[PDB]
Amino acid sequence: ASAYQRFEPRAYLRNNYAPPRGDLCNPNGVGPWKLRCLAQTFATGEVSGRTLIDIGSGPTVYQLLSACSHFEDITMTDFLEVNRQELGRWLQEEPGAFNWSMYSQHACLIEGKGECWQDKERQLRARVKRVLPIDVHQPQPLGAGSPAPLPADALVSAFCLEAVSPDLASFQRALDHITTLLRPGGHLLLIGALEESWYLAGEARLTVVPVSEEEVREALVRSGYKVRDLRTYIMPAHLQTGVDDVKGVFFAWAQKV
Amino acid sequence: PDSAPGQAAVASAYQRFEPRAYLRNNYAPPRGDLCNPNGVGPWKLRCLAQTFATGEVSGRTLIDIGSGPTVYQLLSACSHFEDITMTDFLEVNRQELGRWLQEEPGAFNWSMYSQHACLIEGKGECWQDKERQLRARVKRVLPIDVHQPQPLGAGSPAPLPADALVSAFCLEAVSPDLASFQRALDHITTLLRPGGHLLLIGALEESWYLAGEARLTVVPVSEEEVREALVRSGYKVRDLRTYIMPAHLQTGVDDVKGVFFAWAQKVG
Numbered sequence: 001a002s003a004y005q006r007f008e009p010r011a012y013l014r015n016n017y018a019p020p021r022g023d024l025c026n027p028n029g030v031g032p033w034k035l036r037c038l039a040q041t042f043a044t045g046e047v048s049g050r051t052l053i054d055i056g057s058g059p060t061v062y063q064l065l066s067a068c069s070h071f072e073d074i075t076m077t078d079f080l081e082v083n084r085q086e087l088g089r090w091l092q093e094e095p096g097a098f099n100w101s102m103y104s105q106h107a108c109l110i111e112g113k114g115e116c117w118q119d120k121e122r123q124l125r126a127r128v129k130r131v132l133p134i135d136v137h138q139p140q141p142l143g144a145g146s147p148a149p150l151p152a153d154a155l156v157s158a159f160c161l162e163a164v165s166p167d168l169a170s171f172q173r174a175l176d177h178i179t180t181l182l183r184p185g186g187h188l189l190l191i192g193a194l195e196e197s198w199y200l201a202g203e204a205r206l207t208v209v210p211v212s213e214e215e216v217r218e219a220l221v222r223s224g225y226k227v228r229d230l231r232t233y234i235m236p237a238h239l240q241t242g243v244d245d246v247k248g249v250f251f252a253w254a255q256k257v
Numbered sequence: 258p259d260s261a262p263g264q265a266a267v268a269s270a271y272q273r274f275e276p277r278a279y280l281r282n283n284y285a286p287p288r289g290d291l292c293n294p295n296g297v298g299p300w301k302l303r304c305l306a307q308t309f310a311t312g313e314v315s316g317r318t319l320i321d322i323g324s325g326p327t328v329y330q331l332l333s334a335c336s337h338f339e340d341i342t343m344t345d346f347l348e349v350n351r352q353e354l355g356r357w358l359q360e361e362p363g364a365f366n367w368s369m370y371s372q373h374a375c376l377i378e379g380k381g382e383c384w385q386d387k388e389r390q391l392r393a394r395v396k397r398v399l400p401i402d403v404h405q406p407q408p409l410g411a412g413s414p415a416p417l418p419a420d421a422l423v424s425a426f427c428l429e430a431v432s433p434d435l436a437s438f439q440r441a442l443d444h445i446t447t448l449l450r451p452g453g454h455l456l457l458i459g460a461l462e463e464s465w466y467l468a469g470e471a472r473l474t475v476v477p478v479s480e481e482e483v484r485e486a487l488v489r490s491g492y493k494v495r496d497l498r499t500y501i502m503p504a505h506l507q508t509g510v511d512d513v514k515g516v517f518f519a520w521a522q523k524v525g
């Protein structure tokens with residue numbers, strides 16, 4: 001796991017959220033797809049409550065753009081301090097922060113409530129109350145005396161679990177671990193790569209467990225989830241850019257029984 | 258009785274018009290604040306988008322009358338016309354457009370407007386595609402004087418007659434009085450084909466505005482005077498709506514009391 005110690009936030013953002021993967025203009029791309037799954041799910045009105053926790057946020061905030069308008073108390077997390085630092089730079093409008101505005105705009109476009117992207121960001125920054133350390137390999141991922149209001153009404157996690165797990169079983173356990181933070185009847189929005197085995201973050205090469213959609217489905221089940229929705233996006237050739245070997249992306253809406 | 262003097266005053270005044278100050282005064286916040294849907298900015302765009310959304314205003318050629326240094330007035334139009342002529346009396350304004358067309362950084366930044374237009378047209382178009390289409394479709398930027406019987410001049414490049422006209426805050430801003438306004442309206446109407454459409458936006462009951470040093474005179478007009486002039490020019494008025502300028506948007510840059518938007522279709 002020491003690999004994550006060389007993990008470079010800026011190179012990750014560059015490899016994953018700048019063009020071409022970051023070009024949101026084309027509806028057929030992966031960016032628009034991720035935002036679409038997130039927006040559609042919240043527009044249902046069925047994922048609701050007061051507190052939400054984002055698992056393995058890394059240096060990215062897009063995974064909460066549609067979420068922030070349904071949850072007044074949001075908790076962001078990551079294993080790496082550099083990532084938490086990088087998040088602070090955006091939440092605080094500090095210098096050299098990452099530019100997420102194309103995403104705020106597209107979330108506003110997709111949601112179709114006529115909202116200006118600045119209001120969207122304003123609300124997100126306002127509702128993220130804390131950025132906490134987290135280790136999903138631990139039975140209590142957040143630790144013992146966490147400031148985060150537990151249990152959460154809902155969880156989000158994107159491209160974390162499969163990316164921090166050596167194999168299927170470790171993936172399963174981590175899902176078990178985060179699930180304990182989720183209140184019964186609560187909701188989980190799980191996003192991640194399909195059949196991926198490595199990706200690069202500057203000097204770091206990270207190992208990934210290659211999971212399939214049926215494997216994701218079954219794990220959610222064995223964790224005590226009812227799968228409300230599971231969709232797949234197949235990675236087009238032009239977005240296979242040498243920064244990894246992800247074949248596709250899955251999105252899961254699941255509900256703790 | 259004799260139009261030259263007033264027209265002469267007008268041209269004289271506009272020699273001091275400062276495009277950057279005008280852009281700031283009218284299209285930068287608070288008026289450029291597109292987040293507040295009760296604001297004048299969102300209303301202008303909404304009037305435009307909804308009209309084009311009917312599918313009822315289309316064709317090949319469009320001419321924008323008195324563009325000045327602004328492009329927001331063409332954001333919803335540009336998907337409906339493949340040939341767009343832009344126009345202004347002042348070279349400096351035309352130079353400003355030229356700067357946006359070349360996509361220079363020195364240019365006024367209209368992307369908030371492009372975004373918002375994309376937002377309310379509701380087709381999920383990204384703003385960079387919106388802008389790229391506008392840039393591609395503007396075929397020319399021409400000098401114009403609406404007080405001339407032939408506003409574009411003799412033997413213009415413009416494809417005439419156009420299928421549609423846009424004109425925003427021009428006529429009233431350059432007409433000393435109502436009869437001048439009416440005449441200007443008559444003049445631009447010759448550039449439009451019968452059965453074609455005019456989208457007219459303008460200030461209501463405005464007598465002055467600032468554009469840097471220049472303090473320019475506007476004929477104050479009412480909604481009914483606008484309607485009558487349209488009828489007098491040979492249009493059917495399809496739509497005429499009004500926006501009242503909220504106090505918080507009255508900022509000492511002018512004395513506009515409200516804004517009007519007219520959708521009118523030339524008879525023939």
Ligand SMILES: Nc1ncnc2c1ncn2[C@@H]1O[C@H](CSCC[C@H](N)C(=O)O)[C@@H](O)[C@H]1O
Nearest residue numbers: 056057058060079080135136158159160164
């Ligand atoms: N043992 C662990 N427990 C929880 N998160 C971990 C972890 N080891 C690494 N991580 C974090 O897992 C993330 C994988 S990539 C970041 C994903 C981000 N949410 C996005 O959607 O793009 C990195 O931020 C990494 O630092």
Ligand SMILES: Nc1ncnc2c1ncn2[C@@H]1O[C@H](CSCC[C@H](N)C(=O)O)[C@@H](O)[C@H]1O
Nearest residue numbers: 323324325346347401402403425426430431
């Ligand atoms: N005699 C004339 N004929 C046509 N346009 C004129 C004119 N005299 C001045 N103008 C232009 O009328 C404009 C008024 S300002 C409105 C500009 C822009 N359409 C907007 O929507 O903000 C200025 O650009 C001015 O240069």
